[PDB]
Ligand binder design. Structure first.
Ligand SMILES: Cc1cc2nc3c(=O)[nH]c(=O)nc-3n(C[C@H](O)[C@H](O)[C@H](O)COP(=O)(O)OP(=O)(O)OC[C@H]3O[C@@H](n4cnc5c(N)ncnc54)[C@H](O)[C@@H]3O)c2cc1C
Length: 494
């Protein structure tokens, strides 16, 4: 099934692994690439968003097939289920069965993963804000350029709701309580969204791979392919061990470059199982503390055009990221729509930047194996005093914003359990030097293994509140360009 050797082997098929495939297809066109995804193909073109599947029954099946071992488990698909705090995953995702919490620690009880072609971007709500202040990685002089390139790969736009009736009204009402003393980049503005188009549809990994990857004769995608090991020969990346889930057969695929984009929890898991264990691996894990709310606007009368998505930017002084959105553009069900006046109800979400700690980590136990046969995950996570103060300010701020747009549907703001944001950073984080605090270089290349590159939210080292996918793709673009420059300028061959 698999080639004996390739130039680049890519683990996973989410937007960050898809970014490597795209830039390598554009900038190193002759290079052979094999992408391996453990989950099945659930959409067309491969990795497309499940919400673009018109048939609801076929859409439910695509979501169920994405839930790995939690396929036959009850999910959270209503605002009542979110507020009930039941330890369930949202459709298209699955939770850990054990090792999510430990005594004297908060853990991440609702830490979720997706197993399908396209990763979580086959199920996401495409908010693509830019980082600001201390969120920006300071040692990347080209950060702005890479963020603009990430906008290109995701097809990001801030004008999809320029025809929506309530988008300008929500924006101007939030601006009255947010904008005072802020420079233009930190004022209330439309959220940049990864939305395609024939009505406005969500963008998945299919948009990031694009026609450049799909028309590349040298690229091949293998679904139902579990990468169990990253192979190392002479201290450099040598290939991948891959279990063909359609037969149980385990193969070895040789490669000059190995790119792991397997999400923030499974990327350090695969490195740990391969014997690639630097001291910073899986440490400085950070979730974005999340608070939710809902509000009804004060007026009369697949993706709908109601009020769009408003962005309340993070600042160092007010370290949370806000998003005010129409109910179908929310990462979590927040309210039912108003029957008489539709589009008049908006959801509110605040996400907190974390107080980075070395002891917040994802650890692995070789004595216990998970549903895929890999070392089980142990999550050690705890909110500090500073984290609780910031989360308290976020609960106050979300009420201020909710009252500013209208009449709040709920009396109190609701904090979601740790893991709810689905934005886990820092587990394979980049740094300037190999001091024992970072796993990879500014080009996302693992310090310990030349040729081995990491991808995803785990790469982000800073304390961020904003939705991470756009930044993670921007970092993937820099890593993929280092690979393309090395391949195109090498005297060596395949
Ligand atoms: C409901 C929802 C709403 C969201 N909304 C937003 C939003 O508005 N904005 C935002 O920025 N983020 C949002 N997210 C999060 C976003 O989807 C992720 O940040 C993003 O998908 C991460 O990209 P990734 O490529 O690093 O990893 P993933 O998307 O998680 O993909 C990793 C892939 O690797 C595969 N894989 C893992 N281990 C192996 C292995 N050993 N072998 C082979 N394959 C493997 C997995 O099956 C998976 O498909 C949302 C997510 C959900 C589900």
């Amino acid at each position: 099934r698999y080639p004996a050797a390739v130039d680049v082997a890519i683990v996973g098929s989410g937007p960050t692994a898809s970014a490597y495939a795209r830039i390598l297809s554009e900038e190193a066109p002759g290079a052979t690439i094999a992408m391996f995804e453990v989950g099945p193909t659930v959409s067309n073109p491969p990795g497309a968003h499940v919400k673009n599947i018109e048939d609801p029954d076929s859409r439910s099946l695509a979501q169920r097939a994405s839930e790995g071992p939690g396929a036959g488990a009850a999910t959270v698909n209503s605002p009542g289920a979110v507020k009930s705090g039941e330890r369930r995953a949202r459709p298209g995702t699955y939770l850990l069965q054990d090792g999510y919490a430990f005594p004297g620690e908060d853990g991440m009880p609702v830490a979720a993963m997706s197993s399908n072609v396209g990763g979580m971007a086959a199920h996401w709500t495409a908010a693509c804000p830019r980082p600001g202040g201390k969120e920006r990685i300071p040692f990347l002089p080209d950060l702005e350029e890479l963020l603009n390139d990430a906008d290109r790969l995701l097809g990001v736009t801030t004008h999809a709701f320029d025809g929506a009736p309530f988008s300008d009204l929500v924006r101007e009402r939030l601006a009255a309580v947010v904008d005072q003393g802020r420079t233009p980049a930190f004022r209330v503005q439309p959220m940049p969204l990864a939305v395609h188009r024939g009505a406005l549809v969500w963008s998945g990994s299919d948009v990031v791979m694009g026609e450049a990857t799909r028309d590349n004769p040298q690229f091949e995608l293998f679904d139902e392919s579990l990468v169990t090991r990253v192979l190392v020969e002479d201290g450099t990346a040598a290939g991948v061990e891959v279990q063909d889930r359609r037969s149980g057969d385990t193969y070895q695929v040789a490669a000059r470059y190995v790119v792991v984009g397997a999400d923030a929890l499974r990327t350090p898991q695969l490195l740990w199982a391969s014997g690639i264990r630097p001291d910073a691996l899986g440490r400085y894990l950070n979730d974005q503390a999340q608070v939710v709310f809902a509000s009804r606007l004060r007026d009369v009368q697949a993706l709908s055009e109601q009020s769009g998505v408003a962005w309340v930017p993070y600042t160092d002084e007010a370290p949370f990221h806000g998003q005010i959105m129409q109910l179908d553009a929310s990462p979590v069900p927040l309210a039912d729509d108003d029957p008489i006046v539709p589009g008049s109800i908006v959801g509110l979400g605040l996400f907190c930047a974390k107080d980075l700690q070395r002891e917040d980590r994802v650890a692995f136990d070789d004595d216990t194996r998970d549903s895929y046969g890999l070392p089980a995950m142990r999550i050690h996570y705890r909110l500090t005093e500073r984290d609780h103060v910031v989360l308290d300010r976020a609960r106050q701020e979300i009420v201020r914003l909710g009252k500013a747009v209208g009449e709040p549907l709920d009396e109190r703001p609701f904090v979601l359990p740790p893991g709810a944001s689905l934005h886990y950073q820092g587990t394979t984080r980049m740094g300037e030097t190999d001091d024992g605090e970072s796993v990879c270089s500014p080009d996302s290349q693992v310090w310990q293994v030349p040729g081995l590159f990491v991808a995803g939210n785990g790469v982000i080292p800073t304390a961020t509140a904003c939705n991470p996918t756009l930044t993670s793709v921007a970092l993937a673009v820099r890593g993929a360009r280092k690979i393309a420059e090395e391949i195109t300028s090498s005297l060596l061959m395949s």
